[PDB]
């Protein structure tokens, strides 16, 4: 049976980058030819494995993360990058294998006056360990004063909206990302090309 990529890429709403979803792909054929001939997919960068040769490889399983970020942060979804995304929201490991698809979604995930509910993490006590999601919303102690449950000066709340308007530039419009990941282990293989 064919790959169920129609339920990952063509979903109607994605998760925000501080709390993303991870789906498992198993028992299928990895037909990327329904996906690769979509040339407005403005980024198809592949670390670890090479593009256009995916259909002649056998794998164990495929994990497909999903979130939305603005266009100035797509260079941060990569092994070994920094910023206010790859240290506070979603950090890939250094020896990661998998392609990082990223296209433009300014018609889809954008509306007038902001679309206020795609959050992102501003403050954390330390940088993220790799593949660590973070959903906790306790207030961040910036200075030295423990304020204990009420925010103000030197203790803020660590989530702001993205405020996506369709009249921004090419850099501030929502670039919807899917970063698939591949794994190989000593086991029977359920995901391979035709």
């Amino acid at each position, epitope marked *: 049976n064919l790959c169920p990529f129609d339920e990952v890429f063509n*979903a*109607t*709403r994605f*998760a*925000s980058v*501080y*709390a993303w*979803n991870r789906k498992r792909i198993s028992n299928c054929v990895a037909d990327y030819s329904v996906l690769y001939n979509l040339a407005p997919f403005f980024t198809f960068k592949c670390y670890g494995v090479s593009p256009t040769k995916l259909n002649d490889l056998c794998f164990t399983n495929v994990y497909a993360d999903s979130f939305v970020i603005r266009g100035d942060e797509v260079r941060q979804i990569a092994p070994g990058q920094t910023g206010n995304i790859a240290d506070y929201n979603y950090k890939l490991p250094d020896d990661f294998t998998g392609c990082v698809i990223a296209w433009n979604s300014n*018609k*889809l*995930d*954008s*509306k*007038v*006056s902001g679309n*206020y*509910n*795609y*959050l992102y993490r501003l403050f954390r006590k330390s940088n993220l360990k790799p593949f660590e999601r973070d*959903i906790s*919303t306790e207030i961040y102690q910036a200075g030295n004063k423990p304020c204990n*449950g*009420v*925010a103000g000066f030197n203790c803020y*709340f660590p*989530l*702001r*909206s993205y405020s996506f308007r369709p009249t921004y530039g090419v850099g501030h419009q929502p670039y919807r990302v899917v970063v698939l990941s591949f794994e190989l282990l000593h086991a029977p293989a359920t995901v391979c090309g035709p």
Partner: antibody
Amino acid sequence: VQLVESGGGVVQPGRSLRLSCAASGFTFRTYAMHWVRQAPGKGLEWVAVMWNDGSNKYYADSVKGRFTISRDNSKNTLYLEMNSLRAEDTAVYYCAREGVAAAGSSSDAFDIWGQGTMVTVSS
Amino acid sequence: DIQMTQSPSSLSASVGDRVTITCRASQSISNFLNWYQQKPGKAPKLLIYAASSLQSGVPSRFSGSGSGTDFTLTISSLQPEDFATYYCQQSYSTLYSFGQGTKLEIK
């Protein structure tokens, strides 16, 4: 995930009314509450909005200006303060919420609602 | 302001039928509308958010679809407990808006 309001009752035409919305169970700050209106007999209609941090406070065109909507992130409540309310603005007033981390609730949808306070004019 | 029209305004059916409910927009809404169920005398809760996904805690007999201007809600098999109004609410502008509602009746 429970939600409960208070502060409703009977009032003369042209006075003020605090309307609470005591929130509990979810993290109150990282959402954006609304106020959904249900006139007796008629369908739902929209009244007000807030933002995440309290930035902008838009209103529907029928009740703008006369309504002022507040926010108290320390007590995790919500206040809607209307001024000079008219006799046609008699309804049930609900509370709302919507955030897109898929973990939590349907995006762009009023997922959790209160029991509903009934504001009614009198004479 | 985005005027949104839901059709029809008064429907009738019986147990088991496939019931469709359509909703028309004025201008474009990029798959950002939701479907609500309000039993008479209660709090309206959500069934379909963002026009294609079902809220966790809803029996999977419901189905909705559409993108752009027109959107359809299709109930597969009716039940005695699914006889209530159905609201069409969008999410695009500064001014959010609700539909008019489809009353469901018996035969």
